[PDB]
C-alpha cells in the first residue's frame, strides 16, 4: 500500500501472508474460518506454499505466528486469467488455525448486499509502499 | 521499490463501476469493484488481501485486492474482486468440503 500507515499490531486478525518455500511473501489472504482462507486466483497458490497467520512485522522473530500447510487449492471455475475476472481462490488448510486475539475471521456478505459508491472502507497488506 | 516489514493499512472509498470505467474502460467487469483514486493505492504484494467495510459493528470482506495501475498511482482506482459476486461460490465450496 502506497501512502498508507502502519497498523496496530494484531488489529486485522484475518489478514494472512502467503509465502513460498523460501519464506518470500507474495500475496495476502483473509481467514473466513479456522479452516479456510480467501485469496486472489491470480496469486497462483499451490499446496507447496504456506499460509502465515498472526504476523505483524515480517522481519521479527519474536511473534507467535502460525505457519499453516495448505491441503487443497480451489480456484473458482469462473476465473478468467486473461481479463483477471472472478479473481478468487479458496485455500483449505491441512490443519486448522488456532483462533486467538490476533487470529480470527472476517465476515462475508450476502450476495444481495449493497456497498454504495462513496463508502469508506479499508485495505491492508505487506505490498510495496513505493513503486 | 520499497517492501514494508510491518503490516500497512489505508482507508479508501468505493467507486461505482460506471465511474471506474472512465479510468479503465471495458476492463471493468461486474465481478470487479473499484476503490481508491483517493491518495492511496494497493500495490504489488497486496494482492489477495482484504478490502473490508465496517457496518453494524463488524468488518465484511467486500473486495479482494486484484489489479490496477502498473505504477500504483494514487490517483487511479484500484480494482478488487467483488465478493458479493463470488460469495455464493464460497459458501457452497465450504459446503461441500
Amino acid at each position: 500500500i502506497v501512502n498508507g500507515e502502519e497498523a496496530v499490531p494484531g488489529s486485522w486478525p484475518w489478514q494472512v501472508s502467503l509465502q513460498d518455500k523460501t519464506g518470500f511473501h507474495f500475496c495476502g489472504g483473509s481467514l473466513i474460518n479456522e479452516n479456510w482462507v480467501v485469496t486472489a486466483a491470480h496469486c497462483g497458490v499451490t499446496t507447496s506454499d504456506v499460509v502465515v497467520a498472526g504476523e505483524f512485522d515480517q522481519g521479527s522473530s519474536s511473534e507467535k505466528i502460525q505457519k499453516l500447510k495448505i491441503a487443497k487449492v480451489f480456484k473458482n471455475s469462473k476465473y478468467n486469467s486473461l481479463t483477471i475476472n472472478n479473481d478468487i481462490t479458496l485455500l483449505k488448510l491441512s490443519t486448522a488455525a488456532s483462533f486467538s486475539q490476533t487470529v480470527s475471521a472476517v465476515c462475508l456478505p450476502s450476495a444481495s448486499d449493497d456497498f454504495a459508491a462513496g463508502t469508506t472502507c479499508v485495505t491492508t497488506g505487506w505490498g510495496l509502499t513505493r513503486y | 521499490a520499497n517492501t514494508p516489514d510491518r503490516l500497512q493499512q489505508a482507508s479508501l472509498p468505493l467507486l461505482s463501476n460506471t465511474n471506474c470505467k472512465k479510468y479503465w474502460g471495458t476492463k471493468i467487469k461486474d465481478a470487479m469493484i473499484c476503490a481508491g483514486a483517493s491518495g492511496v493505492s494497493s500495490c504489488m504484494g497486496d494482492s489477495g488481501g482484504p478490502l473490508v467495510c465496517k457496518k453494524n459493528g463488524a468488518w465484511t470482506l467486500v473486495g479482494i485486492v486484484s489489479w490496477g495501475s502498473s505504477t500504483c498511482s494514487t490517483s487511479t482506482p484500484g480494482v478488487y474482486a467483488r465478493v458479493t459476486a463470488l460469495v455464493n461460490w464460497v459458501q457452497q465450496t465450504l459446503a461441500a468440503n
Binding site: 486472489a40 | 494482492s47 485486492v65 486484484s66 489489479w67 490496477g68 495501475s69
Partner: peptide, 4 residues
C-alpha cells in the same frame, strides 16, 4: 496494468 499489473496483477497486484
Amino acid at each position: 496494468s499489473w496483477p497486484w
